[PDB]
Structure 1
Amino acid sequence: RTTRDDLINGNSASCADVIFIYARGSTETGNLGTLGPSIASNLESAFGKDGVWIQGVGGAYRATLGDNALPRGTSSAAIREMLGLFQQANTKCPDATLIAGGYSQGAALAAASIEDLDSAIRDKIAGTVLFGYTKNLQNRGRIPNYPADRTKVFCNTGDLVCTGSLIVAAPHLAYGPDAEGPAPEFLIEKVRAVRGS
Structure 2
Amino acid sequence: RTTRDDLINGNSASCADVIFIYARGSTETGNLGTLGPSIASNLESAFGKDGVWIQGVGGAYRATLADNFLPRGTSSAAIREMLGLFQQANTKCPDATLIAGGYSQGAALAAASIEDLDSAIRDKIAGTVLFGYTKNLQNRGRIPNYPADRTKVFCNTGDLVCTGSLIILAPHFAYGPDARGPAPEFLIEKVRAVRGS
* Cα-Cα RMSD: 0.5
Unaligned runs of 5+ in 2: none
**2:82 is the alignment partner of 1:98:** no
Unaligned runs of 5+ in 1: none
Alignment of 1:5-154 (within 5 A): 5-154=5-154
Distance (whole Å) between structure 2 residues aligned to residue 14 and residue 97 of structure 1:
15
Distance (whole Å) between structure 1 residues aligned to residue 180 and residue 50 of structure 2:
20
Q: Percent identity?
A: 97
Distance (whole Å) between structure 1 residues aligned to residue 25 and residue 105 of structure 2:
5
Once the two structures are superposed, residues 72-125 of structure 1 have per-residue CA deviations (whole angstroms, 9 ceiling, x without a partner) of: 110010000000000000000000000000000000000000000000000000
Q: Give, in angstroms, the shift of residue 183 of structure 1.
A: 0.3
Distance (whole Å) between structure 1 residues aligned to residue 20 and residue 166 of structure 2:
27
Q: Give, in angstroms, the shift of residue 168 of structure 1.
A: 1.0
Distance (whole Å) between structure 1 residues aligned to residue 196 and residue 132 of structure 2:
30
What TM-score do the two structures reach when normalised by structure 1? 0.99
Distance (whole Å) between structure 2 residues aligned to residue 163 and residue 124 of structure 1:
30
Q: Give, in angstroms, the shift of residue 196 of structure 1.
A: 1.7
Q: Give, in angstroms, the shift of residue 9 of structure 1.
A: 1.1
**Off by >2 Å, runs of 4+ in structure 1:** none
Once the two structures are superposed, residues 1-36 of structure 1 have per-residue CA deviations (whole angstroms, 9 ceiling, x without a partner) of: 100000011100000000000000011000000000
Q: Give, in angstroms, the shift of residue 57 of structure 1.
A: 0.1
3-state SS, counterpart of residue 20 of structure 1: strand
Distance (whole Å) between structure 2 residues aligned to residue 71 and residue 6 of structure 1:
31
For this pair of structures, how many residues does the alignment match?
Answer: 197
What TM-score do the two structures reach when normalised by structure 2? 0.99
Distance (whole Å) between structure 2 residues aligned to residue 169 and residue 195 of structure 1:
40
Q: Give, in angstroms, the shift of residue 167 of structure 1.
A: 1.1
- Tell me what 1:165 maps to: 165
